[PDB]
Amino acid sequence: GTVYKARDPHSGHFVALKSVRVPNGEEGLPISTVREVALLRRLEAFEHPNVVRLMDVCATSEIKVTLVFEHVDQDLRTYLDKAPPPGLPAETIKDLMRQFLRGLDFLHANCIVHRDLKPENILVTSGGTVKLADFGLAVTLWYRAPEVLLQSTYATPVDMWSVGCIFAEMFRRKPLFCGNSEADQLGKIFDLIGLPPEDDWPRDVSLPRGAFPPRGPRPVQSVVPEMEESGAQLLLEMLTFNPHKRISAFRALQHSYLHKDE
């Protein structure tokens, strides 16, 4: 189970080879193994350009399942740290957001929730094309949605919150909220978006609202003033507490801020 990596000189095809062993001594292949791998196989029927493509799946007769994945070297963190000293230009940030959202909207549309999006999981080709990876095969809390920090239910809106955090990080180039535990990271969020009201709080949950002091929402230009007015509004619709009011990926791709102007 050592991860391997190879490039093909005749076409530049870059591969990675993940291998996972499964038990399977009674009822053959496990249910999860056969479901999770098949879900990955369904995705590549569409060959989406913003998600890493799976190549083959080799099984071995005490069962080893080896997945040959598309491999790119740079992740978003490396891309961000290599930016021009002033930072990424606006049109580049918009282009990265668009592809990011396209890929995420593809996964959500196929009932896949990333649930752990961080700049280390977002990968960028040398040609400036982002591909999402690490999903549907089975820490830092800086990017987890507040409904996850509260051990409540997840759904696909968890990924849109993560997008909000990464959206602002491309401007700040230091992360948005960096907390030490679940309770405190929740606090740093409320110091920006304000402590949510009463009935906007989830019910069956791990921390009551009384665990947090009254706090009003400070402006968003407080945090990312490198960003135009419309981009500020779009960020808030991602950094919206209630997951049912939070913007979707598809709706974000239609926001005026990401509309390519030619």
């Binding site: 053959g28 292949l29 056969v34 098949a38 369904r42 083959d56 549309a109």
Partner: protein, 244 residues
Amino acid sequence: NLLNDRVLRAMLKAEETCAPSVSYFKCVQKEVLPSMRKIVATWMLEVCEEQKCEEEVFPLAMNYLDRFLSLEPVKKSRLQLLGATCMFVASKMKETIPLTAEKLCIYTDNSIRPEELLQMELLLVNKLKWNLAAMTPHDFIEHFLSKMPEAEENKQIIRKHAQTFVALCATDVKFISNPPSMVAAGSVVAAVQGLNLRSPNNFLSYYRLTRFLSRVIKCDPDCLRACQEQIEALLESSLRQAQQ
């Protein structure tokens, strides 16, 4: 959004992945004959009916069977093994507690052995390159019914009759070349005509229903009607052959 129906678009694209060949009986299979597929299909359906399997287990298993028979020639004596394995995997893909290898072998009258089923599972899955999340007619029926303005009482009956029709198609050679969208569409419109038990009383008329489904799955109305007519014809055959 709901007007564009981007999900319906993805489904028609995804259902081109796991499609078997129309003519593997001439081109791939030497010993297997189209009459032998109706035999094992009938057996597989009876097994899924006794074990009260989920709706899609049997049509999905038949999908796996056809795709494998499109790839490797299979001996007559091993056809039942192939079918028991397809139920095995399909059960895993759609059932909470799948069929056990022990029960499937018993259902072959103890002709096959569990270890052989398990080894046939790896041959099956690898020959299909792990492409097991095939679009089912069920997936399309559920999507169609979500656009039909009909009482939930009515939808439950349309759903049950449609599901029955889907099973009968999965035993007929003629329907191997039909994508799940087409089999689901035909099943639905055939179901809304109600087995002729009484006149239809639908809030969405049969005319609008067929033209809607025909526009949606990208076929001419006369083509979906012929599919409906094949299914109802297949129903007449099913009933005549049951009484002997």
